[PDB]
């Protein structure tokens, strides 16, 4: 409807209505993803509630919205939000696995299928993408990030927004698309010691340099909402951090949508010690520009008094309400509140076979082949497989942050494998035990067969929100099982399922091959069977570093040099940055992964010199020199050798996953704009300095050729 | 000499002499870091400003003599040294001294340290180390007094006072020496405990927690400051103009010699914030570094910088004047040999009085962690199986022991045989447990009645560039403790180490556990007196002992978070917790045991206070046992609501109280309004009205709690 008619609705609402418009509730409070409050809610509140989160189906939505609209004075429908993180009913790989795809289109398609399905079940908004930079795999929520690189995260974040939303300015018309909500603003992933909800602290320069850019990229691509974070940012809970949410989010990032609090985050500023009571919480959150309080009541019980007493301007409340109605209008809810459903059952769009094929393709793009000694893999279709371990038959392959997908529709590893291989003998074991009976049964299966598929992994409940692990290891009984299997003298493939980097040194050393499938989602067992038999060829690269040991954390590829770097020419000298007991290198680095193919790359002649403000054009010719078709991820990194700030030894600035038939050769070009060469300085200005840069072209952060470009002269 | 004659000397120096006055070299050029080709000339070494690392009185005299024969103007060298926790008489490592909670014990260590060092010709000590530490992977935790800014501040002042005494009389008091505060700033926050690694935190947090101990040492009159190896907000400290000009010289009104850490001027290159030695030199001198340690950026580049007009020579004169003013503060222009030349002071080194002082530090600094069922003290006739890698190892002096010698130290066996009549020793290796060790251990335990299991680190596993990713003893030591437990006899573990360690397995496999750290020269007597009860353990933890490596960083002064774990939400899902460990460290800050038992009570406090007013806290303590001992009364404040999320507690006062059996005492603390203040969002030091809780007790966990509402007017 016209902007004038929306603006008129704000004029017409009472104070109590405007207040309750800023409240979101779970469906069970209308006629959980967070702890529950005595909310002292009344009909006056529920009947003017702004939003519902967590509806369980289309029927739930229609029932709630109809009842609500019978009894709402002005005809303002509810907006319905949901956690669709890595799929709705067709579950795709967890986002950390999608990070490892290095494939923007895989990520967009995931989001598009997610939206297709979620809009079918009544959902208008998804609480995705999660754009938190992660350097600490103790934290359970790494599974939700695409990993340790700002650039990759930025790029995949835009891909998710574009997939969920399409053209943002046509969400009133395109009703298989939905609104994206960027979370969690900001820097939540830096939780101290990987402990859930724990203190975050870094300098404002670092926040800008590495922690904000991905939210910013998603905002600038048109993400309709932003969600606040649970953590302090420089000592102030993000939810009532005026500087962060007014100066940065609304000012510098020019964000003009709805700012929804995370679950109880408005009330929690009390626990955090930056508000004495719900009256103070409310005032501070509304001053900071939080528009929508998720499942707490500080606003409804306190805004009136704050405004009547003059401690808060009612203009702040009117702008929140206006952003709330503008959203609803952007989704076309004033002309169709059921958003395509009312007369048109879309159950047919949910869990189609086409969608399953897309999830499966996502799986095989995202898995990461870490070891493959002696061309153990791919296996022949007639290989006789002993399939053993806690992930042989476990249906727990859909991953964390799976609110809507069902395990009964998922494909386990055994089922996946029997579709492809004629001879399979299974011995399932428990996640945390290794009994003598297990060992006898394992030994018999392995004696019968020719190759072992050892299926190891985490339960998904060991990560996600409030799934922090101090030691990033599998249960010891799984390391014992891999050590037992190894004594049996048959080649072993370990297929590892998990949601965070783990200490995998002992697994790599106890097996011939190691494949990291993360949690692929609905099609897990087929993803696994296709990669193992070679129908698909592994093409994923690590988006997060796999530490030598828990105590190496944080370790990441974009790290600073220090004043005493370890060089191969000072090996064994005492006075160098090193540990006494481990290497400085992570066990597996960012951008690392194997293939059944072999590639050669050649970078075209680059200029020695470049002007400031000028783009560097990087041309790369890649050939598949093997007889197996496959995909390689070309990666381009930049380093700034001398700067007014100590800059990282490398930073990814471009990537492209190139598909190549056997013998096939392609050329790809990359533009590194002058923004790629820029950084935040001491005074927090985004700057470009004359000087030397090194450009690295290759297939990991370690397997690269190096080139020198001198930037100076005049400015373009 | 008079200020005018100093100033005049600067006026009379040539440019090359001014440049070279800002160079410090090791004795061999007339090691505590890597060496460069320095391309040094006679003109360089004849005008050098300073020597570090002289190895005796004679070395120094030799060097000053030769040097003074060729220096054109008669400007003597100043000699600096690493005297960190002792010279020849070695005291406990500073982390152990932290656990003393005893200011006076720390001042004496420092006084004895100066007494000895000045005897060997040293004018300056690169002590105190005042880096806040929250990460025990870092080897240099041994050199800090631990995780608390206040305790570090307080003990930091104690050390400055002990080395220096009256700073205005260092030309007169020749048994005292200049202190150099290090490492400015925040070096201890190295990422993942990796040596020299990135440091990053918000400026507010730098002010709130990382800066105050350096500041307290500066205000107490520390004569020098040393730069740190790490970046601070992305810029190597050494060339960090903001840090060194604005904060150090401006806010902290520091007006002495700023010395670089070893090669740190040149290493800004590696850090990537200077292209080359000319850039390094220019930026370090801008930042106000007066003395380049054992690199040559200044020597080879200041001239060209100045002539080219990229640097003003006034910055150089300012650096030179500071150098001369130190020498003059130390009295070198009247006596270049600083009391040595005719008065030989060998007599003052390693005396028995000094030894008794180090033993005393030892018994003040050890921490008794477990003592199940009155195993300790042991009866002097107790028959002891003494086993393990620290049974006989002479490696008990600690890291950062440049000058002390192991032959003069007392090992655990020797200490023990002085007190106990029956001891059977079985020495094992630090990283192995052989079948043969086990047969020999089994037989000694069978013979005796109680096991003294002596476990520990070699000192080379910490100190500078002694980072461990996993904070555990060699697995063979935990195996040994497990084996001993199976033999059925009571076990005391005496643990020797320079860092917090995962000791849950050691506490569970033993009846008593005593943390000696590295006590120094008297280690074996320290151990023997505590075990026999001649001394009663009185140390408390100045650093938290994590449940596991993966808990790090864990510390008592932590923020609440938005979802704190409360007793009334246990095992609920949505609370800050780990799935596999508790939130609490294995042992907390301020924890430790005694063979006595104490009762405390706090007199009535006001419910309200004016802004700017002090809270006066009166505490009556009684020893209610038959055993004389000491307790450390500790007072914490919390700021329940503030414009910045504040820690759940912060230490603001402590006093170690000595009590005979039955004795009772009253001690009063003043908490000034500054103890109620903190750094805000805009980096202002502030006091806000509101509620504070006050906690009085004997650890961060064993406390009574009292509320005070601050507001009203300002005093
Ligand atoms: O369910 C809504 C939200 C709850 N708290 C954590 C968020 O990631 C989630 O979207
Ligand atoms: O030896 C002098 C200096 C060397 N580098 C580290 C410092 O702590 C030390 O005092
Ligand atoms: Mg540069
Ligand atoms: Mg307060």
Residue numbers in the entry:
A (entry chain A): 1 to 31, 39 to 44, 46 to 724
B (entry chain B): 1 to 30, 39 to 44, 46 to 724
Authors' description from the paper:
Three glucosidase inhibitors, GDL, IFG, and DNJ, consistently exhibited competitive-type inhibition with Ki values of less than 1 mM. Thr40 in this loop forms a hydrogen bond with the 6-OH group of IFG. This loop might be involved in substrate binding in solution.
In the gene cluster containing the lin1839 gene, the lin1840 gene encodes a putative glycoside hydrolase family (GH) 3 β-glucosidase (BGL) (GenBank accession number: CAC97071.1). The structure showed that Lin1840r forms a dimer of identical subunits each composed of three domains. The active center of Lin1840r is located at the interface of domains 1 and 2 as in the cases of known GH3 BGLs.
